[PDB]
Design a protein around this ligand. Structure first.
Ligand SMILES: CC(=O)N[C@H]1[C@H]2O[C@@](C(=O)O)(C[C@@H]1O)O[C@@H]2[C@H](O)CO
Length: 679
């Protein structure tokens, strides 16, 4: 077999289910006997078939349907290979979900992929659109030379018992087959020729996190665009993990973004880039003893230009699902204070409180102790800062080993090895900034109002809202949800963020994931759209600045799942078709987080008063990709130009098969012209 290119083809159109034979190519005899090599191809799929082989080599005869090698893509954006010679001899597979796309801005686009079969290193690697997607290691390295009875080289399908299986439909822009193993560098470069949308945060940036989730995007009145997201270190798992909140800004309308920062973070566990296992066992494992922050909300007070970042604060080993019932506060002398448990007391003996100036008091004696905390909640014993060893986490087989290192970090009340431990429920935290993220204020735990009967009271991720007109103009609002006397709730401030008041919006005690976002009506009244535990998105209205809310009404015509998915709904500054408009983003499928769509809702005055005053007509819907393509959490923002920016999870974040994927948080922009189908 010669060194270099064995076969090359260009601009090949393939009719769905027909495939294309490469048997007559001069190098077919070499390709049918490859001991290793590299395949790189550019393609555009126009088919909705489930599995679509791009290139294959194998045995087409009867009874030999399990003898072949093929590189394929799926209608849901997955990509992979299967190297087979019947299950008794070998069946090597490698894939990565949500690796490619089908449609971008209304048109089918080309993706560039590559498979490298490295005999010397006994390794197989898959690449797509400039990224290394997956790696397979095998002691018994195998390739085309190991398949019995190869009799064909085919494009757009895999020949099985004389039939075209895994039928592709579309165009193979280019294909090059090398007998040699090209370097990862050459393949990253070669496949990187086609990319769509951009990353703000990414595996390898200064956050040191390989994964991200829960997007927040907001254009400030100054023109600067800011964003935040969970920096999920231990895979894409929710809290009871190691998660920090990442932040970045753009001063050029969303074209380029600054180096990300970590405004909300904990140091009990080290922040590092780690590849979380995706196998059936390891994928379910998560960090057990780390404190974390989760689900960000960004908000701007246009009157003061101040910005706020909110997120849930989870004590060590705590998440929404295992949070203890209680406020985490104790009332002494009429004032609520954070309570603490001395590590040597009984398991549930929270006999201390953090009072004025961070001084820790003994409640039984009502006398101050020798301990105190700073504005970051780190402990001190007589002005001397307390410390503890930072933990590291590594997999030993399917087991996650969490061990102490020799690195000292300040002892914080939310850490598992702290001498004074906070109550194991969730808290609401926030910091403000007057210089667009250059510096942030001290940690402000605003959840003193958490109902003592609640398991958890958390934020609805995305952005908050400031009322611009009416009696309550200037009021700041942040959506919340809980498992307590109410499900949907809100916290508002009339003094520019200095103080917050909690509001129960219903009397539902089921604790469903009622993530909501708020939009303002022309007269200042508000409409909140929310995820529910039923097969619909609900709408509630307030005519008193968010103090009381109407009963839930299903949002007619916008399909969703029973478990649901977070949504984003924003006010647009200019009228569309002459009417005030709001824009909504959410996956449209009734099962699975996929088929993302952006809708434009036109506000109509019905002629009625009160809660029935306005009616929103969802006149336009825009499909971001094809129906099976992944789309989960998202956040919209009107950019300084007329465009609508979109930061979203381009995969199914609920699925147990799409956990721990790198670089799925994408940033895209769309004009109103595009969104209204007006080209
Ligand atoms: C505080 C918290 O746990 N937020 C979670 C919840 O929502 C998500 C989700 O993708 O649906 C992602 C959020 O980061 O998974 C969680 C689950 O639904 C339990 O509510």
């Amino acid at each position: 077999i010669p060194e270099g290119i064995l076969m090359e083809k260009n601009n090949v159109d393939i009719a769905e289910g027909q495939g294309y034979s490469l048997d007559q190519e001069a190098g077919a005899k070499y390709v049918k006997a490859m001991t290793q090599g590299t395949i790189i191809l550019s393609y555009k799929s126009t088919s909705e078939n489930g599995i679509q082989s791009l290139f294959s080599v194998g045995n087409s005869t009867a009874g030999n349907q399990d003898r072949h090698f093929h590189i394929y893509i799926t209608n849901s954006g997955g990509i992979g290979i299967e190297l087979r010679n019947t299950d008794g001899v070998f069946n090597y597979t490698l894939d990565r979900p949500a690796s490619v796309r089908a449609l971008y801005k209304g048109e089918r686009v080309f993706n560039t992929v590559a498979l490298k079969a490295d005999a010397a290193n006994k390794q197989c690697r898959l690449f797509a659109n400039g990224e290394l997607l997956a790696t397979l290691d095998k002691d018994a390295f195998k390739f085309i030379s190991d398949i019995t009875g190869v009799d064909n080289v085919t494009l757009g399908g895999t020949k099985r018992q004389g039939k075209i299986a895994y039928p592709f439909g579309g165009t193979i822009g280019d294909i090059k087959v090398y007998s040699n193993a090209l370097s990862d560098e050459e393949l990253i470069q070669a496949t990187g020729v086609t990319t769509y949308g951009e990353n703000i945060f990414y595996a390898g940036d200064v956050t040191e996190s390989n994964y991200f989730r829960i997007p927040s995007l907001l254009t400030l009145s100054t023109g600067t665009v800011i964003s935040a997201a969970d920096a999920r270190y231990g895979g894409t798992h929710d809290s009871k993990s190691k998660i920090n909140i990442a932040f970045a800004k753009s001063t050029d309308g969303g074209n380029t973004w600054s180096e990300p920062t970590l405004p909300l973070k904990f140091d009990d566990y080290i922040a590092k880039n780690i590849d979380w296992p995706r196998d059936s066992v390891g994928k379910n494992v998560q960090i057990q003893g780390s404190a974390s922050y989760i689900d960000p909300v960004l908000l701007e007070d246009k009157l003061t230009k101040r910005i706020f970042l909110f997120a849930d604060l989870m004590p060590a080993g705590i998440g929404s699902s295992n949070a203890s019932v209680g406020s985490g506060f104790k009332e002494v002398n009429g004032k609520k204070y954070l309570k603490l448990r001395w590590h040597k007391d009984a398991g549930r003996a929270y006999d201390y409180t953090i009072r004025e100036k961070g001084v820790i008091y003994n409640d039984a004696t009502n006398q101050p102790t020798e301990f105190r905390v700073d504005g970051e909640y780190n402990l001190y014993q007589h002005d001397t800062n307390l410390t503890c060893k930072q933990y590291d986490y590594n997999f030993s087989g399917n087991n996650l080993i969490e061990s102490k290192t020799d690195v000292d970090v300040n002892m914080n009340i939310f850490y598992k090895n702290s001498v004074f431990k906070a109550f194991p429920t969730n808290y609401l935290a926030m910091r403000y900034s007057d210089d667009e993220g250059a510096s942030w204020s001290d940690l402000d735990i605003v959840s003193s109002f958490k109902p003592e009967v609640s398991k958890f009271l958390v934020v609805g991720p995305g952005i908050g809202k400031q009322i611009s007109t009416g009696e309550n103009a200037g009021r700041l609002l942040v959506p919340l949800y809980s498992k307590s006397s109410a499900e949907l709730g809100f916290m508002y401030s009339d003094d520019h963020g200095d103080n917050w008041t909690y509001v129960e919006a219903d009397n539902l005690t089921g604790g469903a994931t009622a993530e909501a976002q708020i939009v303002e009506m022309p007269d200042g009244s508000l409409k909140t759209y929310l995820r529910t535990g039923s097969n619909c998105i609900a709408e509630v209205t307030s005519i008193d600045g968010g103090e009381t809310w109407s009963d839930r009404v299903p949002l007619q015509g916008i399909s969703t799942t029973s478990y649901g998915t977070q949504l984003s709904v924003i006010n647009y500054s200019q009228p569309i078709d002459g009417k005030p408009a709001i824009i909504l983003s959410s996956p449209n499928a009734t099962n699975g987080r996929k088929n993302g769509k952006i809708w434009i809702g036109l506000v109509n005055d019905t002629g009625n008063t009160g809660i029935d005053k306005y009616s929103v007509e969802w006149k336009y819907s825009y499909a971001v990709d094809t129906p099976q393509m992944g789309y989960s959490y998202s956040c919209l923002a009107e950019l300084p130009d007329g465009q609508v920016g979109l930061l979203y999870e381009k995969y199914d974040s609920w699925s147990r098969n799409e956990l721990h994927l790198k670089d799925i948080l994408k940033f895209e922009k769309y004009s109103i012209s595009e969104l209204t189908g007006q080209a």
